[PDB]
């Protein structure tokens, strides 16, 4: 009875504090910046072999190797330059929803509705790819996983929690609680110190890996958040949701900066990704095409329309010379 | 090109062949999704994710039981959905109707037919014969309902359980007829805890669905 009033007073204090810093907007300082113009991208390679909808994709650190996941129960490693296949990995469960590639190039991880994250060893003296360890402990389905090193991994699930794991022992070291809905997307900072999670409660939180405490909470969306991306400089968020709206958040101003939307878009957003320099913003939509956005002007610079179904994956190479897309039509495309 | 690139091409061709071979077996199994509330008797209709397999007339079926706003998106390629409702508990029929309305009008299942199972007919018949609880206590409109002249009751059934059963079936079906525009069909059935013919119904409904898809394919409808 008494704590609700205190919580409301604290929320009002935070709202008043945030409003005091809104002395300018991006739409006003960028009036002296020339537009990027029209950007044309064309298909350079087409990857065939998958027999089902593609759900997950991740680039390697060498800008040549690529991993994809589909509902056929197999994981394929691609050579982007020659289209030759390198490895094919059978899965113990066919309902896979995420995949990841180790920065050292030795391991790949995946998971899904079985509530287990599995790690595969890509370099063995036998020549076969074998399972190294299975991570159990979540109660809901697994939505995303990202590597920190060969021994630490961060996972997100639909039971409102996030966790930090020790691969050597398979024991959970820190649990992150505070969400009220299913957690969809993760994004790991370049400095491997903080990570960001979006959830179905239309809120996003910044977490401290070393301490396990939530630092900031952001609001503004009207529905579930499906994708979160990280600006290269470590001080900005990029989020997508099912209300056909994208938002830009800053970790120092603690408020929204710019909104990306258009009257002709009435479909959901499935993925968000950045270029190296941060000038271009890429997003996947349910209209069977992908849009190119200007992050500093909220304009539309281009569109990719080579798919025949929903776009589910989107990624950029570390050298910035290619973009890969995935759709439910069982095809992958490399754009340049 | 160098010899190692030719060997890599050969390995890629072998991998492509092995992927192509495996797809043949996958397409020969039909996939089903099972949804329902507690006390409905889901586990006995055919007796993270629970799975079961059965075969009728040289056709294999694979049924999935999860455990709904998010994971339902990955079941948009299934042949049919099985929905089970308890027909002998008047207090919770409105919840079942709301659940059926929420499943029928889902945007990701707009092309999937539904097989609807109304279970536990014996308990409903016993409750109607006992007369210790009346449907009008929860559904006012039942007092004005009359058995249709085209009814085909089973011989020996008292003409007081048929009225209730047809009332429940009408209350479920009227939702299905309000939307869909012919893209999908509902297949109501009456079942019980001891019936074994449930296997044939799924096979017949799936064959009908495939026939409808083929008829649509040849520009006949």
């Amino acid at each position: 009875d008494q704590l609700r009033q205190e919580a409301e007073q604290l929320k009002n204090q935070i709202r008043d504090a945030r409003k005091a810093c809104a002395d300018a907007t991006l739409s006003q300082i960028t009036n002296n910046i020339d537009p990027v113009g029209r950007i044309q991208m064309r298909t350079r390679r087409t990857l065939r072999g998958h027999l089902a909808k593609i759900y997950a994709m991740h680039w390697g650190t060498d800008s040549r190797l690529l991993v994809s996941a589909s509902q056929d129960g197999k994981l394929i490693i691609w050579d982007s330059y020659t289209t030759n296949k390198v490895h094919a990995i059978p899965l113990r469960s066919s309902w896979v929803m995420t995949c990841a590639y180790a920065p050292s190039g030795n391991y790949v991880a995946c998971g899904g509705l079985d509530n287990i994250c599995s790690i595969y060893n890509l370099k063995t003296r036998e020549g076969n790819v074998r399972v190294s360890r299975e991570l159990a402990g979540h109660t809901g389905y697994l939505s995303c996983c990202r590597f920190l090193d060969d021994n630490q991994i961060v996972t997100s699930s639909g039971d409102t929690t996030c966790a930090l794991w020790d691969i050597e022992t398979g024991q959970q070291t820190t649990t992150f609680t505070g969400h009220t809905g299913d957690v969809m997307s993760l994004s790991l900072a370049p400095d491997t110190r903080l990570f960001v999670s979006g959830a179905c409660d239309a809120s996003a939180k910044l977490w401290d890996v070393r301490e396990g405490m939530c630092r900031q909470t952001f609001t503004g969306h009207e529905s579930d958040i499906n994708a979160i991306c990280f600006f290269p400089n470590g001080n900005a968020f990029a989020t997508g949701s099912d209300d056909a709206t994208c938002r830009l958040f800053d970790l120092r101003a603690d408020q929204e900066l710019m909104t990306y939307s258009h009257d002709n878009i009435i479909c959901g957003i499935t993925s968000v990704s950045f270029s190296k320099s941060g000038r271009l913003l890429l997003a996947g939509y349910d209209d069977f095409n992908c849009n190119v956005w200007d992050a500093l002007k909220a304009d539309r610079a281009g569109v990719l329309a080579g798919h025949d179904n929903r776009v589910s994956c989107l990624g950029v190479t570390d050298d910035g010379m290619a973009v890969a897309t995935g759709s439910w039509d069982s095809f992958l495309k490399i754009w340049n | 090109v160098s010899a190692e690139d030719k060997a890599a091409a050969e390995r890629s061709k072998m991998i492509d062949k092995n992927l192509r071979e495996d797809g043949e077996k996958a397409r020969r199994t039909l996939r089903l999704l099972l949804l329902g509330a507690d006390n409905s008797g889901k586990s006995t209709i055919v007796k993270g994710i629970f799975e079961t397999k059965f075969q009728v007339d040289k056709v294999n079926f694979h049924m999935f039981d999860v455990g709904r706003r998010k994971w339902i998106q990955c079941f948009n390629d299934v042949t049919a959905i099985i929905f089970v409702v308890d027909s002998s508990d008047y207090n919770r029929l409105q919840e079942a109707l709301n659940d059926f309305k929420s499943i029928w009008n889902n945007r990701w299942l707009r092309t999937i037919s539904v097989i609807l199972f109304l279970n536990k007919q014996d308990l409903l018949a016993e409750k109607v014969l006992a007369g210790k609880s009346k449907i009008e206590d929860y559904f006012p409109e039942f007092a004005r309902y009359t058995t249709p002249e085209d009814a085909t009751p089973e011989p020996g059934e008292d003409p007081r359980v048929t009225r209730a059963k047809y009332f429940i079936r009408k209350e479920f079906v009227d939702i299905s007829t309000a939307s869909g525009d012919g893209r999908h069909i509902c297949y109501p059935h009456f079942t019980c805890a001891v019936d074994t013919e449930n296997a044939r119904r799924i096979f017949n409904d799936c064959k009908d669905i495939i026939l409808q898809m083929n008829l649509r394919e040849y520009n006949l409808v």
Partner: single-chain antibody
Amino acid sequence: VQLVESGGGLVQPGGSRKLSCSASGFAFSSFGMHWVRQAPEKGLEWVAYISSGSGTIYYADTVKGRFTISRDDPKNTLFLQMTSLRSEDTAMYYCVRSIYYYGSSPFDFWGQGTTLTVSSDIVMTQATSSVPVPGESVSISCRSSKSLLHSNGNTYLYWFLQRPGQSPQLLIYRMSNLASGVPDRFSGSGSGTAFTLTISRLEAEDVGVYYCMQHLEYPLTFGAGTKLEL
């Protein structure tokens, strides 16, 4: 990872004999195999190659029409059929495992070998018979007749070390890549048709003969060999 060869013995000229090899401890069906022959006073010589899927088969220019190579995946065995043997065929035969994909090591493992007793090509040049020499630096060089740098950015030069009484062991593949299990004291560099091998600090285990090999076009060619005497 273990490779065992069988067969061998004494034969008369004009006769025939068949060789066999048993593989275990690895996925035999995913690997390609080579047979390499070494004579007492000639060095290493390439004989034949069979692909993992039995797709392509290559033979040396001195064995065509007389030698036949075959593969048996379900039994994890290799076979080499030899007919009309000559006096020049008396030598030791080795079995080598190879796998080809992006970033792989195609000459990582060598067998033990068996003994058989009877009664356009790119030239790889080495010229030193013995380098007398613990703790000192040693540099060994090789020279090729044609450039080994392909347009794709890769240079196909391989290095092997053969200790007394032991099979050759891979040290460097593609001129800059250190093989697994090798200490970091070995390094290599070069460009065009000139190549060098450098050892930072010698030990008692660094005594043997070093060989150079190219993998640009068939047939495969080996160098004369440089002996390091401590």
